[PDB]
Each structure stands twice: as structure tokens, then as C-alpha cells.
């Protein structure tokens, strides 16, 4: 199964809070390993995962080189805010946002499945690198200005050369260093809880805790019949320890609890689970 190295840039203006801010974070799969925050004095690229403590000795220039790259990005996208505002003729008293997401998916053979670079303005698609990694799709007339500038700059080929070369190499390097964290599939710990509401109704809540990676499926059934439409399913949420939690809950009539089952699929489970109260 594939792995992915992904980087996420946010530059935004915050009129009334001071100068624009830039935050750049990396992830391998669902685990964040690095951050850069322009609000720091002399901001540096900084490790956010324990296995990253080992890269200083393997790559003594890693932190200085990543600090330079992120500082350069911080300058580019914060100036970019003023550039794009000018394309739209937007006033500077408003808050605006540029986001960039780029990275690579690698398959089980160690080779690139796909690269991507996409940008958003005020939360909407703005410009994206096409799947051929030589050309750009521009969302509107303003983004066509950007597109022309990046075609003249030959930036797609610089993108392609990173996404196909360096991105893949580094994903492989991180998967090796962070093997114990990244290559785990930690199954959910599951249980059902029982919450009477009224005299004739009760809530059954099916819990999945401590699982990695994030992808999971929770379902309720009644007599083998899928309850998806009637259940309350919360969005998967981080537990703050590097894993995730989810639950699905259902209102059933008192006395009928034994008729319902919870079904859990997660890649760390040897087979899908069925739980009953």
C-alpha cells in the first residue's frame, strides 16, 4: 500500500493582528514530522516527530537547508498575497489567504505513483499543476496572470524534478527512519457504551480508540440491516498522542439493545469486528 509525503503552506493576512503570517507543515501519511512558523523570531524549520531527532546526524545540513527553503517560501507567499489582491483589486483591510499543497505518493515498489502541486486563494482552487507535471490549470482570469508568470519562470519543470526525484527519495528516507511510527497499523480498541435517555429509549455508542492510520469504517446494523442513515457518526479526530478516535451512536428502544451490532473495519484488524451489547 502506498505512502505519501505531503507539505501544507498557509500564508494569511490578519488586519488588526499585525504582519501577515506563514505556517508550513509536513506529513508522512497521517503523521506530522516538521513545522515552520514565521511568527517566531529568527524562525527555523523544526522537528515535530521523534524519529526526526535522528536526521541531524545523517544530514547535518537538513535543518539549515529546510530553514532557508521555508523562509524563502514565507517571503514568496506573503508577497503573493499582495500580488493576488492586486489582480482582483481587493482592499488591504481584508484578510486573505493563500494555501499550497504539494507532495508525492509512492507505491509498494518504491516508485512514484503521482506528484501534485495545488494552490488555493481564499479557500478556493486558484492554480494547480496538471497531472502531466508540465502545465497548469488556472481557475479564472486572475490566476492566468500567475500561470503566465510560472510558464515564463519554467516552474513546472522545477516542480516535476522535485516531485519525481527528491520528494520520493525523502519519503523513502522518512519511512525508514520513522519505521516504528509510520509502518504501524494500530487497530482500534473498541467497546459499546449504553446511555439511557428516557424511559423507553437509550443510546448505544460504538467507540474506536487509539487507531492508526486515520482511515476507518464504523457501521451499525439492525438484524443484519445497515443503519447508516439513522446513526450519528462523528468525524475522525486526533487523540493528541499520534493516533485517532471515532464513534457512531444510535437511538434504540429500551429492551431491544441485543438486536443491534457494531461493525469496525480498520487495516490493523486481522478481520473486521462485530460487537454487541
Amino acid at each position: 500500500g502506498f505512502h505519501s509525503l505531503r507539505y501544507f503552506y498557509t500564508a494569511w493576512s490578519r488586519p488588526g493582528s499585525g504582519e501577515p503570517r506563514f505556517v508550513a507543515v509536513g506529513y508522512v501519511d497521517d503523521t506530522q514530522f516538521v513545522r515552520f512558523d514565521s511568527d517566531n523570531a529568527s524562525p527555523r524549520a523544526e522537528p515535530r516527530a521523534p524519529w526526526m531527532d535522528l536526521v541531524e546526524q545523517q544530514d547535518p545540513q537538513y535543518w539549515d537547508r529546510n530553514t532557508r527553503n521555508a523562509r524563502d517560501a514565507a517571503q514568496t507567499y506573503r508577497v503573493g498575497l499582495d500580488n493576488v489582491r492586486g489582480y482582483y483589486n481587493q482592499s488591504e483591510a481584508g484578510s486573505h489567504t493563500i494555501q499550497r499543497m504539494y507532495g508525492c505518493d509512492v507505491g509498494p515498489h518504491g516508485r512514484l505513483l503521482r506528484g501534485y502541486d495545488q494552490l488555493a486563494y481564499d479557500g478556493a482552487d486558484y492554480i494547480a499543476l496538471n497531472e502531466d507535471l508540465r502545465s497548469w490549470t488556472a481557475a479564472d482570469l486572475a490566476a492566468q496572470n500567475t500561470r503566465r508568470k510560472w510558464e515564463e519562470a519554467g516552474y513546472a519543470e522545477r516542480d516535476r524534478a522535485y516531485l519525481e526525484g527528491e520528494c520520493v527519495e525523502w519519503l523513502l528516507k522518512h519511512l525508514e527512519n520513522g519505521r516504528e511510527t509510520l509502518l504501524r497499523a494500530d487497530p482500534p480498541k473498541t467497546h459499546i457504551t449504553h446511555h439511557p435517555i428516557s424511559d423507553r429509549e437509550v443510546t448505544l455508542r460504538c467507540w474506536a480508540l487509539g487507531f492508526y492510520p486515520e482511515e476507518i469504517t464504523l457501521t451499525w446494523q439492525h438484524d443484519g440491516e445497515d443503519q447508516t442513515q439513522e446513526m450519528e457518526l462523528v468525524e475522525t479526530r486526533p487523540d493528541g498522542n499520534g493516533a485517532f478516535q471515532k464513534w457512531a451512536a444510535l437511538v434504540v428502544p429500551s429492551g431491544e439493545e441485543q438486536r443491534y451490532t457494531c461493525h469496525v473495519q480498520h487495516e490493523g484488524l486481522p478481520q473486521p469486528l462485530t460487537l454487541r451489547w
Binding site: Y7, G26, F36, D72, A73, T146, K149, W150, Y162
Partner: peptide
């Protein structure tokens, strides 16, 4: 690494 080249929009 973070990509080492960035281009102004």
C-alpha cells in the same frame, strides 16, 4: 526537504 524553489503568484 521543503521544495527549495518558490515562485511568486
Amino acid at each position: 526537504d521543503y521544495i527549495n524553489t518558490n515562485v511568486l503568484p
